[PDB]
Coordinates of C-alpha atoms in Angstrom, one line a residue:
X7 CA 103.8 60.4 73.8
X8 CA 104.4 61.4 77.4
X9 CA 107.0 64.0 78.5
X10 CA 106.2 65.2 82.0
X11 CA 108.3 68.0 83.7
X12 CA 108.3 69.0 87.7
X13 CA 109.9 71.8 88.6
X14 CA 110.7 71.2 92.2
X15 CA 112.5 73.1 94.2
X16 CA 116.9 72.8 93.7
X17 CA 116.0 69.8 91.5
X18 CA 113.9 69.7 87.9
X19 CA 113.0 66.7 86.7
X20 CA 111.6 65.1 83.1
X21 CA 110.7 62.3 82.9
X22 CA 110.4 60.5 79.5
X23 CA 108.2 56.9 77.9
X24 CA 109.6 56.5 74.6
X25 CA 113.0 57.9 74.4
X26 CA 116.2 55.5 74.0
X27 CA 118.9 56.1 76.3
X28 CA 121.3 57.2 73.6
X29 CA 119.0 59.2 72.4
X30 CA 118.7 61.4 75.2
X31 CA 122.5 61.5 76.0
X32 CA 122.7 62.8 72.7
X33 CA 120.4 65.4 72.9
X34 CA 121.2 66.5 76.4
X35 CA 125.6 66.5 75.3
X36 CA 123.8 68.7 71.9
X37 CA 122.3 71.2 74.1
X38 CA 125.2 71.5 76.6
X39 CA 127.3 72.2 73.7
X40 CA 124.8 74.3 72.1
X41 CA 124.7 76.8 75.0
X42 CA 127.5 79.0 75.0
X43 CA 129.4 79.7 78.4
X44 CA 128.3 76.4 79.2
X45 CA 130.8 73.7 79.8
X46 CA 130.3 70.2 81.0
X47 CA 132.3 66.9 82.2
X48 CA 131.0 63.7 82.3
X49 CA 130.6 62.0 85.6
X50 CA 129.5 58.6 84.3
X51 CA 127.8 56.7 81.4
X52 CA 124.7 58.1 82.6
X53 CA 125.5 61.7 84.5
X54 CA 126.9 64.7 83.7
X55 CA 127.9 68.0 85.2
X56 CA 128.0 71.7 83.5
X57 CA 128.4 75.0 84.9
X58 CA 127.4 78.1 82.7
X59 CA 129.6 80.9 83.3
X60 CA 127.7 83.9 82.1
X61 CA 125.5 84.4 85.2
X62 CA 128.9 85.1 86.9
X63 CA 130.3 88.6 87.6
X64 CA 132.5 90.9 89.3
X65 CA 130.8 90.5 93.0
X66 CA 131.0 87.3 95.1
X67 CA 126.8 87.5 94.4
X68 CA 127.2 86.8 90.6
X69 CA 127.8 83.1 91.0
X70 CA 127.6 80.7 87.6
X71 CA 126.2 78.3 87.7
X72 CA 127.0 74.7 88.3
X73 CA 124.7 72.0 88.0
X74 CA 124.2 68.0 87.5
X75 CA 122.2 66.1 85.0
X76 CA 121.4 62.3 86.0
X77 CA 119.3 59.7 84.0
X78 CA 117.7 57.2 85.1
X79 CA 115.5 54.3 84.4
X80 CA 113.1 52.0 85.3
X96 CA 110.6 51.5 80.8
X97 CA 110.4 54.8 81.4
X98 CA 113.1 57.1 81.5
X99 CA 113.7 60.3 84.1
X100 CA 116.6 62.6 83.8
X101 CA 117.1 64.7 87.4
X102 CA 118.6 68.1 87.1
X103 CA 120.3 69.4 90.3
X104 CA 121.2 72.7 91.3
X105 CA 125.0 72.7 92.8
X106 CA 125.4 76.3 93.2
X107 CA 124.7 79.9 91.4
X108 CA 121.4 81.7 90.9
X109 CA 118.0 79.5 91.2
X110 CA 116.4 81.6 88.5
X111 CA 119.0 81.0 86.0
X112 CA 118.9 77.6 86.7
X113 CA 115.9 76.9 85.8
X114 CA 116.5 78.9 81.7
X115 CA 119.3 76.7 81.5
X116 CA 117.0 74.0 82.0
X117 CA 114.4 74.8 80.2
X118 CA 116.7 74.9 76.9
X119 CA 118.0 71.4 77.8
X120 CA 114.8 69.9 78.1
X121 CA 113.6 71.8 74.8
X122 CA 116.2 69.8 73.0
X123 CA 114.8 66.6 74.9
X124 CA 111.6 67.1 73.3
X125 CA 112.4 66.6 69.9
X126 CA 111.8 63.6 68.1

C-alpha cells in the first residue's frame, strides 16, 4: 500500500502500486466532475485536460486555471499533473482533491 506524492514545481505527481488503470480513470473523471467550475476534455485513453474557472476574475491577473492529467505505467502506476496556465497556488488545491479521491480504495 504505497501512494507517494511529489509536489514539484509546474508539475505534481502520484504515483501508485496497486491501483488498476480503470480504477484510477474512474476516480480521477469522479473528482473532475465532482469539482464544480471545473470542466475537463479527454485528450486520450490515458490523459485528460480540465480548467477550473473559479480562480478567474474581472482583471487579466485572475486567470483559471487550466491543467493536464497523464497516467502512466510501467507495475506501478504514476499519474503527472501539469500546470498549463492560471495561479500556481490554486493549482495545487485542485490537486490535492483529485488525488484525495485517488486514494480511496
Amino acid at each position: 500500500g504505497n501512494f507517494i506524492s511529489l509536489d514539484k514545481e509546474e508539475q505534481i505527481f502520484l504515483v501508485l502500486k496497486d491501483k488498476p488503470l480503470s480504477s484510477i480513470k474512474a476516480d480521477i473523471v469522479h473528482a473532475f466532475l465532482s469539482i464544480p467550475s471545473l470542466s475537463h476534455s479527454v485528450l486520450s485513453q490515458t490523459s485528460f485536460r480540465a480548467e477550473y474557472k473559479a480562480s478567474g476574475g474581472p482583471s487579466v491577473f485572475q486567470k483559471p486555471v487550466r491543467f493536464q492529467v497523464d497516467i502512466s505505467s510501467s507495475g506501478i502506476y504514476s499519474v503527472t499533473f501539469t500546470l498549463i496556465s492560471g495561479p500556481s497556488r490554486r493549482f495545487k488545491r485542485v490537486v490535492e482533491t483529485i488525488q484525495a479521491q485517488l486514494l480511496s480504495t
